């Protein structure tokens, strides 16, 4: 996150940190005790699928304070329509090997109904994007969980103000001040409505961050609700990586 602030500890309780061999991979979003939503691209290069760790209740990466909860990733589910090294259908559903324990510091974000998400949430101007990504373009990553308020653009308006599909949306600023960025991917775009927070977006990717004349690109989660819901009701299959048809 560029141009953001520190998320006070426990105020981003749905935020997930993904690790590979102890190394920062990506972000994620907790939607249930065993389910995490992330970005498909995060997994393009995964060699040993068995070394994937999800961390909940994380905040300051430099310390252990005891609120942290680590789980192995038992399943990574990706839409069939996703092509590695691209942007379209940049979504992933992760199954935890064991449920996390809900606490003050570990809470899931509401996965909304499609209709609600479409007719209502999609019109809430401002939403919150978070992560432990780069603080700066070509910069170091954050030790402390960062958050950023970003406005959402209609796709028409996005293009005017500038490959955007119906599976994406634009959010942010073009002045180059404020953006989500490398290391943030798979993180939540979280939208408030009537005292509750919802999963509207996933930090995808693009060229740079905080690139003048550009807007941040996010996976349009509303497009995936039914797909996600069906998967969550399904029995685990052997092998970590699973390609599931979309729609």
């Amino acid at each position: 996150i560029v141009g953001g602030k520190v998320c006070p500890k426990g105020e981003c309780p749905w935020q997930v940190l993904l690790l590979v061999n102890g190394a920062q991979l990506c972000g994620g979003t907790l939607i249930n005790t065993i389910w995490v939503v992330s970005a498909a691209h995060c997994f393009d290069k995964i060699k040993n699928w068995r070394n994937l760790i999800a961390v909940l209740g994380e905040h300051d990466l430099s310390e252990h304070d005891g609120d942290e909860q680590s789980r192995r990733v038992a399943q990574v589910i990706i839409p069939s329509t996703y092509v590695p090294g691209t942007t379209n259908h940049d979504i992933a559903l992760l199954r935890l090997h064991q449920p996390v324990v809900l606490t003050d510091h570990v809470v899931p974000l509401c996965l909304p109904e499609r209709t609600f998400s479409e007719r209502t949430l999609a019109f809430v101007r401002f939403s919150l994007v978070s992560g432990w990504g780069q603080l700066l373009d070509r910069g170091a990553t954050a030790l402390e969980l960062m958050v950023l308020n970003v406005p959402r653009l209609m796709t028409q308006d996005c293009l005017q103000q500038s490959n955007i599909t119906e599976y994406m949306f634009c959010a942010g600023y073009s002045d180059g001040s404020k953006d989500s960025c490398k290391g943030d991917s798979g993180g939540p775009h979280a939208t408030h409505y009537r005292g509750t927070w919802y999963l509207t977006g996933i930090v995808s990717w693009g060229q740079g961050c905080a690139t003048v004349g550009h807007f941040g690109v996010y996976t349009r989660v509303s497009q995936y609700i039914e797909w996600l819901q069906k998967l969550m009701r399904s029995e685990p299959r052997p092998g970590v990586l699973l390609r599931a048809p979309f729609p």
Binding site: L109, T115, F116, R119, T120, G195, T196
Partner: protein, 57 residues
Amino acid sequence: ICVNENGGCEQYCSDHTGTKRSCRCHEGYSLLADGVSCTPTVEYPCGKIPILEKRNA
């Protein structure tokens, strides 16, 4: 209608045949008798921030 003002619903909303409308609530919530409002039924419902909820309790 659900398309307008969210049908007055705090959360989820379904249109029915006629001038009929049904509000709903996410798991870990219950619908109040006003037929629009949702209240938590659990300690840690989704999309709520405990330290902030407690800060106002």
